[PDB]
Design a protein around this nucleic acid. Sequence first.
DNA 1: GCCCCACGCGGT
DNA 2: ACCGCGTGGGGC
Length: 105
Amino acid sequence: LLSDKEVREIVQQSLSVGNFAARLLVRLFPELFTTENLRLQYNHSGACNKKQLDPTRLRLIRHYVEAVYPRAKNDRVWHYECIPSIDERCRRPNRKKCDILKKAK
DNA sequence: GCCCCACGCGGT
DNA sequence: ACCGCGTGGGGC
């Protein structure tokens, strides 16, 4: 639960509605985005042998998304732009692979 | 370096 | 067909 001021401040910095959902994810799930990087054990559905993000916080994220971006009320926009960005955010690595290969030399 | 997003691909 | 992962081109 976060203020209207803070939601609009998040909208200011997000690039697309997918990134709005990703940012609301990071802000609402600060436990997973410490240097512990627990995010790498989670996704939005509980698929691919991974733990499932808090369904109710995810619902709140969708609430804010469909609120700011009304077009998000279609499941075909949430399921196709936000939850892919949410899962990518939870899973994306610290160091890129090719960057790790490049720092070898 | 951080961060975003498109995208081939393999399991379902 | 669909769905999520690993991955890298690339803007900042």
